[PDB]
């Protein structure tokens, strides 16, 4: 096979990155804001069914380095190919050039590799969008980026993207100044809890978070945390 | 030419999505029930085959139940072909894995491996995809007992009970009102049974016509037995549910 | 070039794959065929059907030899059960007789062949063979065995079937005719007996082809004073021994 | 002119009085038969090129 | 579409269409004249700049201090077959010691367009080129078609406008053949005969591209205030 | 969409056009471009680019379509910004290539040349080039620079395969305003500093927001300097100096 | 041959010498044993002249690449461990490799890596490499303080050359200086090894065994 | 059995000047004690004033001078009639030679030519790869015997002011094109009766911003 | 669609594709070989497009060894390939048993290679027709190869537009020569029937060439008729049918 499944549109795209961004917007919200010496990456997770084991699924925020996390949406089968390049990426940059990835290079590899199953031949793009955050090493500046499916590459100051991302970006102008982030790390946390309870609502238990801090310290902050969280800003609204 | 005639089908719709998945997925619910429900002490696998006839000799056939390895094994549900081929895979993938540590595959690590193959299929080469679905059951000491299913898109997710294959909807309903956290595995084997019989696409429901099959911790010493029943074990424990 | 390495096979909007959907409705446009299976042995008979009358018969072979205690039979296309009869002894003789030195049981064998309908199910430039295939065959361990393996791929086993245009008709006709125990001298007059009411041909044992997987026999053996082995469990019914059978019923 | 069918020849007759007329004469030159060749065929120019 | 769209097919006139297809390349194409005498071959190629701001893209590449070819049709087919040419004539030059025969280099050209014409997911060159030299047995011109004719003349023109070239070619081709020996002249019938095939375009001295080849002159390409000697 | 196009089935295939539509399309994409005015005079050459803005939320400082080959050789990317992210690695490469092999800096218009036949070898195989691209890049360049040979060039190169050498050129979505105003304010008599303000009196009239150096960003390449990237602070002065005579007026 | 390099206060000095010999015959008494990595690497030349030139111009080819790349100029430890990668390879397809990459960047500071023909990769403060190690660094061992000055530096990277010189048999030639600091290297100059012998002989009151 | 490297002689000699170069080399070919030609050119003008002479075994020392010249074209062709110099040219001749070392050219490779101040240029190779600029530099099978007479006259070496001893360094004087010439014959001269393997015939190339200009002298038949 | 390509079949024994390739060689010009006693003498009718070529330099007669004459009809470039290809063939077989080729061996090579052609999706069937032949040491033979892959032997055959006026005027001649006729007589009559073929095709003029391979005239090769025996020919001709 060596057949195009990409045929160019007199449009002034190719169809099948369009019909990618689509499958994108079904996909489930992830929101990214940065704070002065945090991350903050809260995704939506479908909890609404019943009897499902959590507990040894993984969360839909993956860890590629112990300093760069990943978090994604679109086609949740797809994604995981992504993850497992790019983690092998992150180790060949120590073998062969020592020391860990920088944020950059990595959100840069990984723009290089949903771009090139779009121009190669005998494949289609794939319809997945990350959410690439993280820490530089030796440094102490959020770099907060985004990749999309077509294979274009952003940093921000903070950004949405997934199911009806419009009604948190619209929020996010307006709660969160470009000048200055939320200074603790707890505010920052309850800013994006507060964001995430627009679009997700229906009780605190479809809401995760993830907070990373320099110096190579990912943890996943639990239902329970999340729960204190979530009451506080209920009161307070 | 050869271009003219391509199908391509590994395109997306204008929607984002794949045709051919979804149509794997409505062709699985024509082939039989498998219900796996995670029992404190083992897991329940319980399968209603998807042929029957008093000529068929279905007494040899495990032919929804197959062991990848003495600790994981899988109940199948949809063309069975396709699902052959995967399944030595996943032999291969486990002796492997053997063979390099010299320890025994965790349940998350062989789940991965399936389906990334099937993801593989679907999303380029021009294939169709391979049209399977699987419920493990499967011990290890790092998470447990773990209950999983995957779909021929390639993507997994865990549970404490599913069901696969037809009236897939009906048999979530049931499973959430007659479900606790923790059972024996007795009472496990009942529900199992049980859902069997409400769900069943023909009025009676019968031990040649099920294949059935646990994993206990009724083996000492923290071992994990691995039974698959002969149907004349089958016979005895549904005169005890009172089904039959 | 060639670009035929896409999906000839593709699930259908309605579910189901068209293509091994229509393979089956020809394996009921050809020959009939049934197997019973008894407990000291295993029977297979089928016609033997040509273009004209003046054509041999006995150059021409619709009960195949895997090996020695393993015979197939089919109903379907000639053409494509003459390829795959050759490909299922190459991976025979390739996967376990040098890997074992020996011959695969009935199971193992089945299987193997089922990978091969399997790869013209998937890719290609390949359609489905149009064969439904009998394997009946002993081995020691679980004894005699009888199976169907069909264009899709999967396999069953049976206690008694048939395959081919008259299938329908024919299973209800043992069904009552299969008992718990049946011998394999009472077998062969029930196999004649049901492929009489599905053949109208004249009735003779040059027109009905008779194979057992019935009991060893060491006078095939090729060879003597080796006790340790013992001969095919095969046995292939030439047209006299059918010629007494044919009046004893 | 090469390749001009009998209704373009008589379109370039033709079209040299409308010229004829705009210079304002009364007679028609040998210069304006000319420019209907241009003004009048059947094609309007070469396309645009980029590259041919 | 009927059999239209399709290298591979026929076609029950017994043509293709694809083939008239790649012909348009030719007639799109901006005028190219070639004439020879016995002494010297001359390429006259009209350039053509896309604005004021830009400058005018070459259309003649030399190929060899005795050979060049210009293009009329599209700029990336030609720089295919500019390579190609190149790399026949250094490996004549290697192994056999030896100036590329003009004759045997057409038929090489030929069965490149060709093979591109009868396998599927090919294309046919939307790319004429005109192939002056000077060898051994003098000089010559070489006309290329998409189809993959190849022919030797004594002086033709492919273009747009090509039919104003050629009716001009058969007034003044018994002049040319006797002039030899002054290279100067046959320059001047070459402006003179790309003056025939404008369309009110002018001639600059940076629009009109000379090239030459001698008996003792080598492939040379003029354009600056060189051609305003001959403008 | 859905704009009469008769053929468009090969990604070679023709045509009535007497040239190829898919390469037609590809200069369809640069009128999407965001905007980039390059003017080049023979004392420097200044690529000005527009980043872009698309939210508040939007870092639009670290965003950029100034991009480096090399120190003497500047480029700029319009139209399809992911099919640059290859490109500009392999003319990277190409620049290095020629120091490896010559250890000398490579002419503008050969650096130009290179990235033109990369950019046709779409295909599903054919020629001397084994295509290894399906689809023709959608995105052209204007690659500015500087040898000590020819001077200063400036080149627009194409997804078609074709280089113009311009003496100044801005190609994006405003591409046919900027155009009418290079015609007649450009000429051959400019310094740097009324070129370099006359970049921003053109970004002005294709500026979607207004002019500040929160979304536009100006670069140059000099002969004795190398190419430079200009910083905001820098950037702003001259935007001001700008608005200074403008409202002189 | 020998190629030395010691860190100190400064930065690095590097000191060569310039006579690359081929059998008992000396071929060429004015090669040039640095090879510029970059204006901020600094490559020595010893074992095989061919094999150790050729692949420190193509690892320069690389580093213009690092450094386009992450807009940023190529760490002294990913160069090395390049170059590193690269030569085991040949490792036992027969060739040779001695090189100390010398460099101070910002982030990193002065490091020295010692890359080797078999994919060795050794850090230190010093190495010597060559067939006259054993005489440099009995005298840069002994004349060595961590804390120096540079003028007292750069007369280090001659003394121990000299010595080389001296006794070993295929170094002479002429020896350069550079010296690296973070900005870059600043070259030195050439100074003939044996007129440099007249002066120090005179200055230290040294090499009382030549006669006269 | 077979072993593919013999030699083939020969003696050639570079020397740079200040707006001169000259690279001379003898017309001799031999394969052991047998005479095979007295007249074989080994100084080839390649184009450029850029004159190459590979010297040593024979068939080699024709082998990159049949891609070198084949790079002269190819660089011309894709750069449109660029001029290339003799710090450009180096470095080509170097990916050659190094390219193949698991199967080496066994050659003395030597260039010479102007550069852009309008001085001389010469530039050695030696078998493998890697090259340093010199200002004289013989090779070949005589090698040893031309180069310390042309140091001792060239750059002077140890030599000093007359009549101060050792106190005062010689100055190194100018170079002119007249002289170099007279260098030249006079150890050509010195080669051909101390040195079994140079005869025949020497030839002069002298190459300058002027012209290339061949000049040819006898030398002794044995 | 069915009537579009060569691997498809339908169901009148039609595959309408290799038909189609007839009428491409039908465009051709004239080219006749006649099967004489000694050899086999070609002659093309080579149009004369504009009095701007250069005449006699375009050769439609090409060798193929030494020892087979090949020339064919229909489309030109596509003929080229053939005649390459067959080339090839004739050098592989040159070496590999060290002798020329037979011609019933030549004609088995080039048969099957446009026979291939009608079995891929990827592939047109060429469009030519060829004639050729020569000597060798099992006598003279000549064939004429369809582009369908058909051929046989032959006493006289030819292809063309003006295959009608040539095809009749054969049956003369063996009805003239029942017997046979010189390989030098037959010159004469190359010219004949070449200039009336120009009796479907007067909208232009046109140059003859002519070519033998016989035994007894040139040793067994491939040459070409040429200076005043070629003019001999001309006038015959041209005085008939004046």
Same mark, same amino acid.
């Given at each position: ?237 | ?244 | ?249 | ?52 | ?231 | ?5 008769? *053929? ?16 037609? *399309? ?224 | ?212 | ?222 | ?242």
């Amino acid at each position: 096979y060596d057949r195009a499944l990409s045929i160019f549109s007199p449009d002034g795209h190719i169809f099948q990155v369009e019909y990618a961004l689509e499958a994108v917007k079904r996909g489930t919200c992830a929101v990214g804001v940065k704070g002065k010496n945090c991350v903050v990456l809260g995704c939506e997770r479908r909890s609404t069914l019943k009897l499902q084991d959590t507990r040894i699924t993984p969360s839909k925020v993956s860890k590629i380095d112990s300093h760069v996390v990943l978090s994604f949406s679109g086609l949740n089968a797809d994604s995981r190919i992504l993850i497992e390049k790019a983690r092998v990426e992150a180790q060949s940059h120590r073998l062969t050039l020592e020391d860990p990835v920088t944020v950059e290079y990595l959100t840069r590899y990984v723009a290089g590799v949903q771009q090139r199953y779009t121009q190669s031949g005998g494949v289609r793009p794939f319809g997945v969008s990350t959410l690439i955050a993280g820490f530089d090493p030796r440094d102490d500046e959020p770099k907060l980026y985004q990749t999309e499916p077509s294979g274009i590459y952003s940093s921000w100051s903070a950004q949405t993207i997934g199911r009806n991302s419009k009604t948190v970006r619209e929020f996010l102008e307006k709660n969160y100044d470009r000048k200055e982030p939320p200074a603790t790390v707890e505010e920052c946390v309850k800013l994006t809890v507060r964001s995430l309870l627009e679009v997700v609502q229906t009780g605190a238990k479809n809401i995760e978070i993830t907070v990373v801090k320099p110096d190579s310290d990912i943890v996943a902050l639990s239902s329970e945390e999340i729960n204190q969280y979530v009451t506080q800003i209920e009161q307070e609204k | 030419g050869s271009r003219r005639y391509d199908s391509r089908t590994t395109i997306f719709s204008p929607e984002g999505r794949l045709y051919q998945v979804e149509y794997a997925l409505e062709s699985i619910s024509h082939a039989g029930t498998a219900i796996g429900i995670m029992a404190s002490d083992g897991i329940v696998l319980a399968a209603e085959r998807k042929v029957t006839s008093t000529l068929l000799e279905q007494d040899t056939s495990t032919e929804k139940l197959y062991k990848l390895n003495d600790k994981i094994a899988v109940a199948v549900a949809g063309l069975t072909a396709d699902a052959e081929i995967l399944i030595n895979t996943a032999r291969i993938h486990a002796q492997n894995y053997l063979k390099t540590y010299n320890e025994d595959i965790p349940v998350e690590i062989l789940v991965r491996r399936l389906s990334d193959i099937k993801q593989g299929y679907t999303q380029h080469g021009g294939l169709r995809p391979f049209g399977v679905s699987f419920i493990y059951a499967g011990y290890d000491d790092r998470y447990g007992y773990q209950l999983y299913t995957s779909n021929p898109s390639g993507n997994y997710t865990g549970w404490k009970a599913i069901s696969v294959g037809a009236n897939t909807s009906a048999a979530q309903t049931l499973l959430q009102m007659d479900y606790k956290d923790d059972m024996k595995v007795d009472d496990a084997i009942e529900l199992a049974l049980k859902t069997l019989s409400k769900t069943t696409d023909s009025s009676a429901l019968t031990y040649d016509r099920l294949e059935f099959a646990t994993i206990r911790k009724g083996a000492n010493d923290g071992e994990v037995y691995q039974k698959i029943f002969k149907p004349q074990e089958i016979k005895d424990i549904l005169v005890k549910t009172g089904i039959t | 070039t060639d670009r035929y390495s896409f999906s000839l096979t593709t699930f259908s909007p309605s579910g189901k794959l068209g293509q091994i959907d229509y393979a089956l409705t020809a394996v009921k446009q050809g020959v009939t065929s049934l197997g019973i299976k008894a407990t000291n042995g295993v029977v297979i008979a089928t016609e033997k059907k040509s273009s004209s009358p003046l054509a041999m018969s006995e150059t021409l072979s619709k009960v195949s030899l895997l090996t020695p205690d393993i015979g197939a039979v089919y109903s379907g296309m000639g053409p494509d059960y003459r390829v795959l009869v050759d490909k299922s002894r190459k991976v025979a003789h390739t996967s376990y007789k040098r890997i074992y030195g020996e011959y695969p049981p009935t199971k193992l064998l089945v299987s193997e062949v089922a990978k091969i309908m399997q790869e013209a199910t998937q890719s290609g430039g390949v359609r489905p063979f149009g064969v439904s295939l009998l394997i009946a065959g002993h081995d020691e361990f679980n004894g005699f065995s009888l199976y169907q393996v069909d264009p899709s791929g999967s396999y069953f086993p049976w206690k008694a079937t048939a395959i081919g245009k008259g299938s329908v008709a024919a299973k209800t006709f043992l069904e009552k005719r299969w008992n718990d125990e049946l011998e394999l001298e009472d077998a062969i007059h029930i196999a004649l007996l049901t492929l009489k009411e599905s053949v109208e041909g004249e009735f003779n044992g040059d027109t009905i082809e008779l194979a057992i997987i019935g009991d060893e026999n060491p006078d095939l053996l090729g060879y003597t004073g080796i006790p340790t082995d013992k001969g095919p469990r095969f046995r292939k019914l030439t047209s006299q021994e059918i010629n007494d059978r044919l009046e004893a019923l | 002119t090469d390749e001009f069918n009998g209704a373009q020849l008589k379109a370039v007759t033709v079209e040299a009085g409308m010229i004829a007329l705009r210079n304002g004469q009364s007679s028609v030159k040998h210069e304006d038969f000319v420019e209907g060749i241009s003004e009048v065929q059947a094609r309007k120019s070469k396309s645009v090129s980029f590259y041919a | 579409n009927n059999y239209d769209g399709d290298t591979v097919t026929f076609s029950p006139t017994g043509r293709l269409f694809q083939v008239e297809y790649a012909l348009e390349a030719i007639k799109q194409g901006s005028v190219t004249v070639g004439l020879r005498s016995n002494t010297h071959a001359v390429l006259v190629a009209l350039k053509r700049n896309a604005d004021e701001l830009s400058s005018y893209q070459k259309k003649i590449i030399k190929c060899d201090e005795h050979m060049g070819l210009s293009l009329a049709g599209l700029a990336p087919d030609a720089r295919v077959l500019s390579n190609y040419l190149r790399q026949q004539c250094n490996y004549s030059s290697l192994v056999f010691n030896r100036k590329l025969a003009v004759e045997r280099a057409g038929h090489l050209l030929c069965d490149k367009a060709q093979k591109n014409t009868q396998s599927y997911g090919g294309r046919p060159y939307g790319v004429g080129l005109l192939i002056i030299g000077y060898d051994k047995s003098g000089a010559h011109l070489l006309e290329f078609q998409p189809s993959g004719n190849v022919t030797e003349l004594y002086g033709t023109a492919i273009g747009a406008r090509s039919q104003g070239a050629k009716t001009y070619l058969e007034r003044t081709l018994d002049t040319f053949i006797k002039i030899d020996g002054n290279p100067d002249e046959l320059i001047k019938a070459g402006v003179e005969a790309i003056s025939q095939s404008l369309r009110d375009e002018s001639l600059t001295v940076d629009n009109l591209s000379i090239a030459i080849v001698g008996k003792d002159t080598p492939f040379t390409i003029y354009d600056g205030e060189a051609v305003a000697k001959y403008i | 969409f859905l704009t009469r196009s008769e *053929y468009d089935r090969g990604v070679s295939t023709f045509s009535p056009e007497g040239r190829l539509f898919q390469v037609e *399309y590809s200069l369809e994409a640069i009128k999407l471009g965001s905007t980039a005015i390059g003017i080049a005079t023979k004392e420097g050459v200044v690529l000005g680019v527009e980043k872009r803005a698309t939210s508040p939320l939007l870092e639009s400082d670290s965003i950029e379509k100034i991009v480096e080959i090399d120190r003497h050789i500047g480029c700029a990317m319009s139209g399809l910004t992911a099919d640059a992210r290859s490109m500009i690695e392999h003319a990277r490469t190409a620049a290095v290539t020629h120091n490896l092999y010559y250890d000398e800096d490579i002419n503008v218009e050969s650096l130009t040349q290179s990235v033109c036949d990369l950019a046709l070898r779409f295909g599903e195989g054919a020629s001397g080039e084994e295509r290894l691209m399906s689809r023709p890049f959608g995105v052209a360049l204007l690659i500015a620079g500087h040898d000590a040979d020819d001077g200063y060039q400036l080149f627009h190169a194409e997804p078609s395969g074709t280089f113009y050498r311009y003496n100044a050129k801005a190609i994006g979505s405003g591409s046919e305003g900027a155009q009418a105003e290079l015609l007649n304010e450009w000429h051959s008599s400019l310094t740097l500093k009324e070129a370099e303000l006359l970049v921003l009196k053109i970004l002005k009239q294709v500026m979607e927001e207004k002019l500040d150096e929160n979304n536009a960003q100006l670069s140059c390449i000099t002969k004795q300097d190398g190419f430079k990237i200009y910083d905001n602070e820098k950037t702003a002065e001259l935007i001001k100096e700008l608005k200074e005579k403008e409202a002189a007026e | 041959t020998t190629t030395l390099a010691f860190r100190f206060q400064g930065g690095i000095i590097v000191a060569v010498d310039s006579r690359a010999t081929a059998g008992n015959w000396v071929a060429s008494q004015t090669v040039k044993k640095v090879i510029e990595i970059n204006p901020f690497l600094l490559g020595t030349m010893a074992g095989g002249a061919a094999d150790c030139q050729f692949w420190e111009t193509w690892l320069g080819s690389q580093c213009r690449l690092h450094e386009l790349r992450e807009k940023e100029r190529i760490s002294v430890a990913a160069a090395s461990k390049i170059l590193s990668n690269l030569v085991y390879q040949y490792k036992g397809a027969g060739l040779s490799m001695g090189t100390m990459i010398c460099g101070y960047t910002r982030k990193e500071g002065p490091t020295i890596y010692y890359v080797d023909s078999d994919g060795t990769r050794l850090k230190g403060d010093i190495f010597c490499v060559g067939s006259g190690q054993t005489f440099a660094y009995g005298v840069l061992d002994s004349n060595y303080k961590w804390d120096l000055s540079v003028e007292d530096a750069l007369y280090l990277g001659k003394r121990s050359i000299l010595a080389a010189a001296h006794r070993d048999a295929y170094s002479g030639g002429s020896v350069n200086l550079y010296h690296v600091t973070e900005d870059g290297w600043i070259y030195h100059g050439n100074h003939d090894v044996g007129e440099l012998f007249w002066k120090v002989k005179e200055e230290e009151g040294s090499f009382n065994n030549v006669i006269g | 059995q077979f072993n593919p490297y013999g030699d083939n002689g020969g003696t050639i000699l570079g020397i740079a000047g200040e707006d001169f170069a000259v690279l001379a080399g003898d017309t001799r070919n031999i394969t052991d004690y047998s005479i095979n030609s007295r007249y074989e050119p080994k100084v080839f003008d390649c184009g450029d004033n850029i004159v190459m002479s590979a010297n040593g075994f024979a068939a080699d020392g024709d082998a990159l001078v049949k891609r070198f010249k084949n790079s002269v074209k190819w660089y011309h062709f894709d750069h449109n009639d660029k001029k290339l110099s003799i710090n450009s040219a180096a470095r080509n001749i170097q990916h050659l030679l190094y390219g193949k070392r698991f199967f080496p050219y066994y050659v003395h490779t030597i260039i010479a030519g102007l550069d852009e101040d309008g001085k001389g240029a010469v530039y050695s190779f030696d078998p493998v790869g890697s090259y340093e600029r010199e200002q004289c530099r013989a090779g070949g099978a005589a090698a040893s015997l031309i180069m310390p007479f042309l140091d001792n006259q060239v750059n002077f070496k140890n030599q000093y002011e007359p009549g101060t001893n050792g106190k005062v360094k010689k100055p190194l004087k100018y170079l002119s094109v007249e002289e170099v010439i007279k260098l030249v014959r006079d150890s050509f001269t010195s080669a051909t009766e101390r040195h079994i393997q140079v005869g025949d015939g020497l030839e002069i190339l002298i190459v300058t911003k002027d012209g290339v200009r061949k000049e040819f002298y006898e030398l002794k038949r044995d | 669609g069915y009537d579009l390509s060569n691997s498809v079949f339908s169901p009148d024994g039609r595959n309408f594709q290799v038909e189609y390739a007839v009428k491409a060689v039908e465009n051709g010009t004239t080219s006749i070989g006649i099967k004489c006693n000694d050899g086999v003498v070609f002659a093309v009718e080579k149009l004369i497009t504009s009095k701007l070529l250069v005449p006699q330099k375009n050769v439609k007669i090409q060798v193929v060894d030494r020892h087979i004459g090949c020339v064919y009809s229909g489309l030109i470039p596509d003929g080229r390939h053939l005649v390459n290809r067959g080339r090839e063939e004739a050098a592989s077989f040159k070496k590999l048993y060290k002798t020329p080729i037979p011609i019933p061996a030549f004609a088995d090579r080039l048969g099957q290679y446009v026979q291939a052609h009608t079995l891929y999706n990827s592939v047109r069937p060429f469009g030519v027709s060829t004639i050729f032949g020569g000597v060798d040491k099992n006598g003279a033979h000549l064939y004429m190869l369809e582009p369908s892959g058909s051929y046989w032997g032959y006493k006289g055959a030819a292809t063309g537009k003006g295959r009608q006026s040539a095809k009749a005027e054969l049956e003369k001649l063996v009805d003239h020569h029942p017997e046979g006729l010189s390989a030098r007589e037959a010159v004469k009559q190359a010219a004949k029937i070449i200039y009336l073929a120009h009796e479907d095709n007067k909208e232009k003029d046109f140059e003859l060439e002519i070519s033998w391979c016989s035994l007894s005239e040139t040793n067994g090769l491939h040459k070409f008729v040429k200076g005043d025996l070629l003019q001999e020919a001309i006038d015959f001709a041209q005085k008939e049918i004046n």
